[PDB]
Structure 1
């Protein structure tokens, strides 16, 4: 079972760092295909280079978003999976029709345990699991009773009150529902805008030992202070722009 990891990314100071640790984590997972989609005007040498040197099975996609982020990027990754092309690097050919697999939307700053991926390979339709440090809670996750989702441990308002990092979708189910995609105009409702097109919340498949284990965390990275850089810039002694960071 191949896991297709859809990751939207964009240029900012910590981008490479984020992509370095994420790709390093992904290199630990077998049968994984990374669909990295840049939110840019064109492919950046930084991303293209990072990908070429990652040694991972990947497909490079690009699409600019002129409010929810990473939407147009994730939707383009979906278009590719549905055979509508759009690849600028890596494996240009999408999985053939009727190919088995599972799609997982992994943002570039979260922390993913390697165990997480083994949990989602068995996804029939859509599976769910708790996500740590998100929604203002220690963890947010499905309430399970006798192996069935009977509710959700959440504090914010949503038929699918789960974070992007808390679910995976079987590839066949996404191909069967050609219209299923994220709504770029959807506010906490991004995840639902996709899932509503696929399953009923009561049919979600709980993983992570019936949602008793946190295997992914919604970590965020601090924005680096650049006061000293600006100062050195004024003196014409800024950090060499030819040295990538």
Structure 2
């Protein structure tokens, strides 16, 4: 009865894409009962992503939706939520947990073991976010979340990064109209726009030893320097990177 972890990964075409998806896939290959829901920000599924997913052997679902003329990945994560609701029935039986994992963060294997038992919504510290070494939920001696240890808008409903929480699939199916808000939404408030509709602070399940350990890092990859390619290009455009 090991719950399935649906990892929702929005992605888009840029130089370092294949590298990011590659080291992420290498991490995910270690996780049992995993379903990788990859959603490309493109007018159609790209062959680069299709082939990489195909060759991993992982159980994946490859979707796509192009963002028109709002936080990156929003429409993509939203498409994943709709897919989940159109694929699994409200009062379904197959247990699952949903996690929104960008393709460039760094994930420890222990993170997945921690979120797998999520009953409602689970939370944990995330490194390198909010201009800090890490942001972390504030948990009391009783083990309940009572606040957020952050510097940027510490009073928002849920002051936590996308990579800091997971949701039991049941809640996603029940709250069928809850999506990430892309309309008039203040910075750093998108996570709240969804979580506020799904759970209350006191029902959050603190992970990572009552939020004292860092199991996930918000790593950013530098844009590669391609100046020597010139205007005409030097390397073979048909060679995939």
TM over 0.5: yes
Instruction: Name which of 94, 100, 103 aligns with 2:95.
Output: 100
Are 2:83 and 1:80 aligned?
yes
State TM-score, norm by structure 1: 0.92
Partner of 1:242, secondary structure, is coil
Q: Which ranges of 4 or more aligned residues in structure 1 deviate by more than 4 Å?
A: none
Unpaired runs of 5+ residues, structure 2, are none
Partner in structure 1 of residue 207 of structure 2:
207
CA distance in 2, matches of 1:2, 1:26: 13
Q: How does 1:118-137 map to 2 (within 5 A)?
A: 118-137=113-132
Q: In 2, Cα distance between the equivalents of 1:135 and 1:32?
A: 29
8 A Cα contact 2:163 2:216, kept in partner: yes
Which residue pairs with 2:145 in the alignment?
A: 149
Find the counterpart in structure 2 of residue 36 from structure 1. Answer: 38
SS of the equivalent of 1:103 reads: strand
Q: Partner of 1:175 in structure 2?
A: 173
Distance 2:99 2:83 in 1: 14
1:118-144 residue CA offsets vs partner (Å, 9 max, x unmatched): 101111110000001111111101011
Q: Report how many residues are paired.
A: 231
Aligned partner of 1:244 in structure 2 is 240
**Is contact 2:38–2:63 with CA below 8 Å preserved after alignment?**
yes
Residue of structure 2 equivalent to 1:87: none
> Aligned Cα RMSD in Å?
1.1
Task: Give unpaired runs (5+ residues) of structure 1.
Answer: 84-93
Q: Give the aligned partner of residue 19 of structure 2.
A: 17
Distance 2:191 2:99 in 1: 12
Deviations 1:166-214 (A, max 9, x none): 0000000110101111011233011111101101122211011111110
Q: After superposition, what is the alpha-carbon deviation per residue over 1:70-116, rounded to whole angstroms, capped at 9, x for unaligned?
A: 01100111111111xxxxxxxxxx34551311000000100000000
Whole-angstrom distance in 1 between the partners of 2:213 and 2:8: 23
